[PDB]
Structures are given as C-alpha cells and as structure tokens.
Amino acid sequence: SDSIELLKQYPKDSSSTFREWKNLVLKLSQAFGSSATDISGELRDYIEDFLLVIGGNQRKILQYSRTWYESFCGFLLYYIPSLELSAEYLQMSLEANVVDITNDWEQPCVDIISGKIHSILPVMESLDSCTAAFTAMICEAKGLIEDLFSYRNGMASYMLNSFAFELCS
Amino acid sequence: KRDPVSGAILVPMTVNDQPIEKNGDKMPLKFKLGPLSYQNMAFITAKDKYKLYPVRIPRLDTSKEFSAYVSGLFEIYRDLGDDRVFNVFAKEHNATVNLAMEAILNELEVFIGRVKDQDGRVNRFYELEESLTVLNCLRTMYFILDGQDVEENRSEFIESLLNWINRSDGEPDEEYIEQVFSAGKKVFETQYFWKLLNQLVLRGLLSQAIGCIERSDLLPYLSDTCAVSFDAVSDSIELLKQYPKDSSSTFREWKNLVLKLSQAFGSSATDISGELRDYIEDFLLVIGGNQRKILQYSRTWYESFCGFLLYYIPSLELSAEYLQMSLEANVVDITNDWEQPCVDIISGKIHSILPVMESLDSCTAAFTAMICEAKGLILEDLFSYRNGMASYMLNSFAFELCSLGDKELWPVAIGLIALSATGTRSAKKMVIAELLPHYPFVTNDDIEWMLSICVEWRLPEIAKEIYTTLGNQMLSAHNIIE
Amino acid sequence: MQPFDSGHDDLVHDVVYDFYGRHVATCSSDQHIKVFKLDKDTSNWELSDSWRAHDSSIVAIDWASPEYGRIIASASYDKTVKLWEEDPDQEECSGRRWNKLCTLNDSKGSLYSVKFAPAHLGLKLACLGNDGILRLYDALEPSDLRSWTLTSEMKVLSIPSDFCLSWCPSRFSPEKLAVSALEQAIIYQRGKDGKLHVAAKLPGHKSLIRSISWAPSIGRWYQLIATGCKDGRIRIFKITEKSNLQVELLSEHDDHNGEVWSVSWNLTGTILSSAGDDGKVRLWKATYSNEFKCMSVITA
C-alpha cells in the first residue's frame, strides 16, 4: 500500500525530490525485506522483486525487462539518472535481450546512445530522405559529426544536396 | 587458457595437490585475500584437510619487466604537462600528444619484447600482443592525421595501417602458402591461388604478392599462350613493385596507370582460358579499387577495410562506409579479442574498448584510456563515475599498485592519484592518508619520502605514527649502554 | 604456489594475515594457535611458533594495528577470549613466544568470532558468543596492555547456529559494526550518547550467514559489506549515510551452487573473494555502474 502510494508521487520535476524518493523506497524494501511473512513464500518474492525494481536493483531491472530499451529506461528511472553510465546501461541491456530487426528504429537508437551517430543517417534516408537530410544537418550543428556533391564536404552537407536535387524533380 | 561454467577464466590452485575431488563430496572451503597480491591464502575446515594453500591472484604480473613498464608509462604521463586534459594551441597540442602515443605504443613493444624472451610465450604474452594490436589500430585512426586525409602524411599513415593489419594475426602464415603449391588445373587456374594472391594484395603484402605470381605462369604459360595476357600481367607486377607510400600525388598517378592498364586489358582480345581471363581482371579490378571486388576477395572484414584505403579512396571520411561494407561481407570474429574493439575504434565509439583492454592488462588499458581522453576521444567520491571514466581506470590502477608490494611503484601509485585532474584537493588528501599506512617501508630513504608526503599533503597524523616507529627502534637501540 | 602442513592435529578454523601481510595466524580444534612467517629470500612459509592457547576448540583470530604492538587475539568454545603479546626476545617453535595479556571470562556461552575494531577508534575489540550477546572490550589505557574494560554489552537475539562480525575500516566515517547471527545481519553504530544502537539490517538471507566483512571505503563515502550465505549466494550491499542509513542491494550471485563459506576483501576494497562447497574461489571486481562481475576463478 505504501508502494502504490509512493508510486503515485514519483519525482518528475525536482532532482532532490528523487533522492528523497529513492530514499524512502529503499527504507521500505528494507523493512519488508527483514520482517515476517504470512503470505505465500512465492508471492513474497514477486513483491520483493517489484520493490527491488522500484529501487533500481540493476540485477532485477534486467531480469524483468522484455526488451533492451526497457531495461535501459528503468536504469535511468530507478537507479542512477546519469547519462554517464549511458554506455554501461546499454551493454547490460543488449546483453540481456538482443536488438530486434523487425523494427527499424531500434538499431539507430542503440547507435545514438552508443555515440556513433553518423550510422543512423543512412537508415533515416530509406524512411524519408527529407527528415534524414535535416536530421543530419542539425546533428552537425550540435557537433555530433569542384565536387560540391562529394564526400570531402560533410556527409551532412551531402545529404542536403541529395534532397535539394531530388526536389527539382 | 580455460573458461568455466560461471563465465570468466579458470585456474587450478595447485599442479600436484588438488584437495577437493569427486562431485557430491562438498567441504567448507575458506579463502582470504592478502595485503599482498601475490600472497593470499586458501584453506579448508575439515578433518584430514590441514594444509594451508597460498594463492596468487590469477594473471598477476610481478615481472621486473612490468614494474619497468609501469615506470615508463608514468613518465610519459607526468611529462604531458597540463596537456593530459582537453578543455571542453589548436595544432601544437595534438602533435605533442600523438608523440606520447608513439612513446606509449613503444614502451609496450619493449615490454612485449623482454616478455617473449624471459618466459617464451606464456598467457601474459599474447594478451599484450593483442593489447598492442588494438593500440596500433587506435593510433592509425586518430593519432596520425590530426585533421586532414591520407594526404597530410601518406608516408606515416599507410605505414601504421599496414603495420596494424599485419601486427594482428600471423596469417597468411608461411605454412599455408606451400600447400597452395602442391588436378587437371595448374597452380594458377584454381581460385585457391588467386583468393590468396588477392589477399596478399589487400593486406599490402606486395613483396610476396609478386613472389606468388613468379612461382608459375608469369614468364611461363602466359608468355607462351596470350600476347596481351603476358603483358597486362607483367606491367602489373611491375606497377606493384612501386606502390606509392610517400607521395600523395604519386598515388593519383599510380591509380591512374593501373586504371589505364585494366581498361586496356579489359577491351582487348584474349587467347587464354575464358576462366583465367576473369581471375586476371579481378586481380586488376582489385588493384584498381573496385569496391565490388575488394569485398568479394576479402576473407575477413579488416581485410576489405584496408584494401578500400589502399586501392580506392584514401580518406578516413568514408571510414564509416568502408566498415559497413566490410562487416556486411564477413562478420566480426569472437575468437580474437582485438576485433570488436577495433570495429569500435573505427566506428567511433571508443569508450567501449577500455573495458576489454582491462581484462587483458589493467595497466595498458588504464593508460590507453588516459591518453584517449587527452586526444579528446571521451561528491566525495574520487573513485566515482562523476570524474572522467579515464580517471576511473587510472585510480583503479593506482590502487592495484598498492597491493603489489613493489615499494618502487608506490610513488607511481600515489602521484598518479594526485595528478588525476578530476577530484577535490581534499578528495585525494583522504585516499592518500588511507593508502599510506600500508606503504611497505624499509630504508631511511623510503621513510624520508613518506614524510615528504606528510608535508605536501599535510597528514599530521600519519606523521606522528611514523615518529612512533622510530620510537620502537630507538628503544631497542637504548639496549646498548655497552 | 605450494601448500604446507599447518601442523594442526585437528581441523583448522581461521587464518589471519597481520597488517603487512607477512605473517598468518592459524587456529584449529587442536586447541593450538600457530603463527607462520613469510621468508623474504625464499618464497616459502615456515612456522614461527605453535602453542596451546585454549582448552577447547579455537575458532577465530585477528591481529591488532602494529601501532599498538604485536597483539594476536583469539576466541574459543571454552566460552572465553584470550590476548597474546608477542615476545621479541624469545625463541621460535618454543612455546614461550606469546603471553596471555589477559582473559575475558564474561561470555557465559561458547564464543564464535572476535575482531579488533579499526585503529582510529583505539585498541578495542568485539566478540560474539552463542548466548547472542555482543561484548566490546578495550584497554582504556594503551600503556598497560593487560587490563581491558567492558565498554558495551548488547544482546542480539535468541538461541534455539553460526555467527561472525566485521567493523567498518574507514577512518573517516562514524564508528559502526556489522554483526550477523544466523539468518540475520544487523548493523550497529555509535550514538551521540556513546552507547550502541541498531542503525540498519541487511535483508535478503534465506539461511545462516557463514561470513560477512566490511570493505575499505577508500576514495568513497558509500560503504560496502559482503555476505556469504548458507543458501549459496553472495550479496553485496551499498550502505550510504545521509535513523539515517540507506541499505541497497547491489549484486547477488549463485555462481557457487553450494554454500558461500568465506567472503573476503582486498586491502583497498577493489577485489572481493568468495569460497564455497564447489571448492572454487571466485574473485569479483566492480563495474563503472557498480554491479559486480567475476574476474577469475580458482579450483581443486
């Protein structure tokens, strides 16, 4: 009951509030963890797991994830909100559940997160040359990457004059 | 080595006296980690088992060569002034760093050297051998051509690349060549020949590539079968002899001729086998950099990647594309550790190699990470995730040294923690105070040093404890009114 | 690395390294304590001195910071603990190389484990008996290493069995001790009033807890304490201190398939060792994410 009531108020605005939150969640799963239980021995586990996950137990967050992006999210939501471990979180997730090929956006994301951005461009092109073109553009802005239509000039620049042209037709 | 049921490496505790036996008969086995890495202890509480099994941490390096390696890499570090930090001076910075890379890369070569000698080729060897490979690749990609393409140092680049490609695996080994020279077809009529000749041409092993041709048809068959065929093959073997490795314009003129040659041979008459005619075009198309063929004839992924740069377009710009076309042809091998780490280096995601270099040698990895932060390729918790992942591995090493009992690398361990550009002046003032009472001291010298740190950092307490120590000697030294 | 005869006539219990990891102090059911020395020249260990220490079976041992002398402490099933100051001006293999600095008869039940508190608190020591009573002794005055007084005397729980404990090494964190009795594991901290208090518990154990040790929080503030359980699972907890303690469960590993008997830490809290029924000893290192991954495995 105290979890369903703690869940109602998961910090989404204040950073200190998150700390106090994880704080209580941890005090809760600690209490329940070392006390007496008169419910099924099996039902007792499903509850700890629930609590451990709310708590950000790397170990469990993986166990209960169905895909890779799930576990990745949880890590940030209930463990440590730091894009520094961005690399580690990904590895622990993909190692749990491989990337799907059925859905185009997955690999491109694993690439985004892993850092290698250039490798998504091509794929966005086969979906919509337009979007891809502008994506590449701004991504050069942010700094994530006689032959005006060469490869000597950015793959960004290149993808614009590939749409710029495609337009004339 | 041997990898067991739970994942990692499996090492026997003893070579002649295994205490536990059969499956099912379990005994309470207790194991304590010692203050000295090489001196741990493993014992068993159970009647008839009263021996104490001293154990050393799997794959530990006590080598005089190693503590000689750590020393060297430290210098290169302390010498990189404030250059070890890349502010979140444009060309001067790089240059000095790329050199320290060579300095590092080198030291590893020397240590890798003395190793082949002393122990022959034990586990520790190959590990460093791969550690190096990964390093050659790293340098090839970011520690040669600061900002321009293969033009600004074709000489330096192509050397590194060709070095990396052949400083990886023995192949093609001299023991496999001879087989291809031992069935209705003559030596040079079976793909198993060309697929080798083209591999030799892709890795840039041109000196031998030519040797293989000279083994059969060149002066023979061709010269006596087809006029155009004996020619196009002679002018290629003569064009191969002089592949541009210094001048960038020379490359252009080179590809230029190669293309004029494969053009001629391509639209002329042929009186040799219709099948032999193809193997020759392919050879030529590959020398010419026909993306399509370079793939076809590559055995691995790193092969095709190299060829692309060697015979097509020497521009690390298409670095991304070359990789994709290669990996899509032949997947990365898992049998050899250095492969994935390279695909990562080239693809850009560098951070992901560090972990792997650590499981090979925590030391190399640690310094690799360091300089890679220099180049710019990447709360009381000094040992946190907040401070640069570089810094992480660097203190993760400094801490290792402490448990290594090498009273020499101790200064190396300490000053490593002090220079960690990340962390509060106090942060370290603590990690030091805690790591010091352990300093395996002896001589008066070792003691003066240890005091000079009670100075530079102000550990007034440790200071006193020292005065205690002298107090224990002075007393036993009052026991001479003789 | 070759073994060597402990020389004990009855099963061996504890083996402790002194500060500089030069010597190791054995102790078994043959009621004898043996200290071994590591020869600088040859990489071999050789008996420094053996001597009947207790009347019953001896089970625990632990040295005391060299800044307090050469004091080995021992606990036994004879319901009493004994201390021994090494005599530098003696023989070896004799038996007159260590003296009973004192004897702690207070425990009205067989003792199981005794460990010296960290040096920064003084010359103190804790010991847990079968009566489920913690007892803290300390020669209030470092000059007379013979008179120890009774600081605290807390009672854990009932006696319907295994015990052990480990202080908190860190010299920069408020004094605290973690004790484990059977299927329980409780952390104690010093109060504003100078009396002990229960600061938190490590939840999750299904069987008895064979071994538990606190880790050297060198470079960090969050504490770490590992658990070797009878159920066959290692547990690593992350206690952060803002009641004011938070207890996190970091890892958990069944890799042993039996019972985790001995769990031990590095001297800088960089490596963790786990030994159990499967007669193998696994060593663990921490990840950037702070999850624990085994780096190597030894066997038999």
Side-chain angles (χ1 to χ4, degrees), chain B residues 431-444:
Chain B
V431 189
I432 303 189
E434 284 193 297
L435 285 159
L436 206 60
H438 294 273
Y439 178 62
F441 77 72
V442 177
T443 297
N444 170 54

Side-chain angles (χ1 to χ4, degrees), chain B residues 160-336:
Chain B
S160 193
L161 161 55
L162 284 176
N163 195 82
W164 168 64
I165 286 294
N166 303 304
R167 183 80 189 193
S168 56
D169 58 301
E171 278 202 291
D173 61 301
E174 47 200 293
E175 195 154 57
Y176 175 68
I177 307 174
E178 311 191 304
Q179 299 184 300
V180 201
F181 291 80
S182 60
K185 312 173 186 173
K186 295 181 179 181
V187 186
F188 55 74
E189 293 182 62
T190 317
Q191 50 175 48
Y192 291 66
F193 166 97
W194 298 100
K195 292 200 170 178
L196 185 184
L197 185 49
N198 292 290
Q199 275 187 57
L200 282 176
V201 184
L202 290 178
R203 307 213 186 195
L205 319 176
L206 307 166
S207 59
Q208 303 153 305
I210 297 187
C212 293
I213 309 177
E214 296 196 312
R215 295 287 187 174
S216 42
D217 87 308
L218 176 59
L219 301 188
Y221 193 76
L222 282 187
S223 177
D224 311 303
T225 313
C226 183
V228 195
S229 298
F230 161 80
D231 263 302
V233 173
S234 295
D235 310 335
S236 53
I237 300 173
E238 189 174 54
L239 269 172
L240 277 167
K241 290 184 176 178
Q242 61 205 64
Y243 165 35
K245 297 188 175 181
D246 313 345
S247 197
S248 295
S249 302
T250 303
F251 180 69
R252 304 169 183 180
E253 307 189 308
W254 191 80
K255 198 180 179 188
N256 200 140
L257 317 194
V258 186
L259 283 170
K260 176 81 175 189
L261 194 168
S262 63
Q263 181 200 230
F265 179 73
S267 52
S268 197
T270 275
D271 274 318
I272 56 169
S273 303
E275 193 186 69
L276 180 66
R277 152 150 212 175
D278 297 301
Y279 287 128
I280 294 189
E281 292 206 74
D282 288 37
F283 182 66
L284 296 182
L285 293 172
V286 177
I287 314 168
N290 167 217
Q291 302 183 83
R292 178 71 164 46
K293 240 66 180 181
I294 307 180
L295 288 202
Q296 196 176 80
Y297 285 78
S298 295
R299 201 61 188 173
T300 80
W301 64 271
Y302 46 74
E303 301 203 310
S304 44
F305 183 61
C306 182
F308 283 143
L309 286 180
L310 287 183
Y311 313 99
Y312 188 51
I313 304 174
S315 178
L316 280 180
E317 180 49 26
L318 300 151
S319 63
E321 273 300 309
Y322 288 179
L323 185 62
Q324 171 173 56
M325 307 196 128
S326 303
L327 289 171
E328 185 170 54
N330 298 65
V331 185
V332 206
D333 200 315
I334 319 170
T335 300
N336 292 58

Side-chain angles (χ1 to χ4, degrees), chain A residues 26-46:
Chain A
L26 283 169
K27 175 81 176 189
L28 195 168
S29 62
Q30 182 201 231
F32 180 71
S34 50
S35 197
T37 274
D38 274 318
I39 58 169
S40 304
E42 193 186 69
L43 179 65
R44 153 151 212 176
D45 296 302
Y46 287 127

Side-chain angles (χ1 to χ4, degrees), chain B residues 397-464:
Chain B
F397 185 43
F399 278 65
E400 197 173 316
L401 298 168
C402 292
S403 320
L404 221 70
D406 197 305
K407 53 185 177 192
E408 274 308 301
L409 310 198
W410 259 84
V412 188
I414 294 286
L416 202 63
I417 288 186
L419 305 163
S420 179
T422 53
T424 314
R425 157 160 257 292
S426 276
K428 310 167 191 167
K429 182 189 170 193
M430 273 171 88
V431 189
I432 303 189
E434 284 193 297
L435 285 159
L436 206 60
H438 294 273
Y439 178 62
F441 77 72
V442 177
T443 297
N444 170 54
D445 287 348
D446 302 55
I447 306 166
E448 286 199 297
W449 173 69
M450 192 162 99
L451 295 182
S452 76
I453 309 183
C454 284
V455 173
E456 185 192 59
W457 284 108
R458 315 228 106 201
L459 294 177
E461 259 298 69
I462 283 178
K464 295 177 186 178

Side-chain angles (χ1 to χ4, degrees), chain C residues 23-42:
Chain C
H23 310 105
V24 290
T26 316
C27 81
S28 61
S29 290
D30 82 307
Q31 322 153 324
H32 280 41
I33 293 180
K34 295 193 174 183
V35 185
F36 287 56
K37 181 195 173 188
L38 181 55
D39 192 46
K40 297 184 180 181
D41 293 59
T42 59

